[PDB]
Amino acid sequence: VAAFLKNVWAKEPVLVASFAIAGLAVILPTLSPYTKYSLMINRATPYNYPVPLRDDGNMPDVPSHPQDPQGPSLEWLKRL
């Protein structure tokens, strides 16, 4: 597990680098704390028009204006 590894690093350093970089690419996004922010930034990107809701009278979480407090915010993106 250690003599074989030094053997293949002596013989085939191209392939050892290949399998090592591939293993990092596989396992490292599951261990990264910033994988969540990739998802959060891709859903924060407004490609479509924010089609507004008809005010039935009881929607306390939906704002009446963009500058209202309620609604989704992007403080985390400006700060990080």
């Binding site: 680098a17 290949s18 970089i21 690419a25 996004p29 994988t35 930034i41």
Partner: protein, 314 residues
């Protein structure tokens, strides 16, 4: 007014290819402890003109061609593709600003093997056909790592737009996150243009030996246009310069200096190494560059996700 812009693209291409031959002979001279041409012009500046006039009044070699039509079409295709690779190049503004300029260049460079193949079959020499098949197999082999390295770099760009690649590199050169991609890219562009140490069309017959001095000169100048173009594309891709939009000539001077140094680096690599054997650069591609290229493609897919550094689409 646009036709003036097309002519000011493609006539300076031919002039730069004309004087690249002089620069190659001079630089290969001084690296070989001799001088290059300095008799014909002052400092040899009339050597490409004299050589063009010599080649265009040399006797036609007059081959018996298997096909007359493809024998005509192969220089036409070579020069047309070697001139159309320049039109999306952002330097700082492209002639044709297209959304998929990277993929356009990859496609038009993938079409360049038909000139080699058609000129090899259009000759009656079977050994010229064998050399053409070896050259085509070499070129299509290194196109694989071209496409995958280029994809792995444009995972940091966000699009296939070549002008966006300047915006991508405003804070740092893209050779810093992608120098292994840069070095395999650079050797793959060295093997695309059949450039030494990958020039087996001069290693012991070329695919275009049945052409006369004029048409072989047209193949030769299409090859050097490809060389300057791929060095400019590598400069845009990994060494992207500062761009003030009110002063575009700063970017033009900067990418021009970097592309000249990279073309001279091609000249300096051919003054340094012996050739590969044919199986040895096949071994270089399939067993060395392609596993690293696939591994780094996995890395450059997963890396903007794990660092939250996905580039924008627009």
């Amino acid at each position: 007014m646009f036709m003036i812009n097309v002519l000011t693209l493609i006539i300076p291409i031919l002039l730069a290819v004309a004087f690249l031959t002089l620069v190659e002979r001079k630089v290969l001279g001084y690296m070989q402890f001799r001088k290059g041409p300095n008799v014909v012009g002052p400092y040899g500046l009339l050597q490409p003109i004299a050589d063009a006039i010599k080649l265009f009044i040399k006797e036609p070699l007059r081959p018996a061609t298997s096909s007359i039509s493809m024998f005509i079409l192969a220089p036409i295709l070579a020069l047309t593709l070697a001139l159309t690779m320049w039109i999306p190049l952002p330097m700082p503004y492209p002639l044709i600003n297209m959304n998929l300029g990277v993929l356009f260049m990859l496609a038009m460079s993938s079409l360049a093997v038909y000139s080699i193949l058609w000129s090899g079959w259009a000759s009656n020499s079977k050994y010229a056909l064998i050399g053409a098949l070896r050259a085509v197999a070499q070129t299509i082999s290194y196109e694989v790592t071209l496409a995958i390295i280029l994809l792995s770099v444009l995972l940091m760009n966000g699009s296939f737009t070549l002008s966006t690649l300047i915006i991508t590199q405003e804070q740092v050169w893209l050779i810093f996150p992608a120098w292994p991609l840069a070095m395999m890219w650079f050797i793959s562009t060295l093997a695309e243009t059949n450039r030494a140490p990958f020039d087996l069309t001069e290693g012991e017959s070329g695919f275009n030996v049945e052409y006369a001095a004029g048409p072989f000169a047209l193949f030769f100048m299409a090859e050097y246009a490809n060389i300057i173009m791929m060095n400019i594309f590598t400069t845009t891709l990994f060494l992207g310069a500062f761009h003030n939009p009110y002063m575009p000539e700063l970017y033009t001077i900067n990418f021009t200096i970097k592309s000249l140094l990279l073309s001279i680096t091609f000249l300096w690599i051919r003054a340094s190494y012996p050739r590969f054997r044919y199986d040895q650069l096949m071994h270089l591609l399939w067993k060395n560059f392609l596993p690293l290229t696939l591994a780094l493609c996995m890395w450059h897919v997963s890396l903007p996700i794990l660092l939250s550094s996905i580039p924008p689409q627009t």
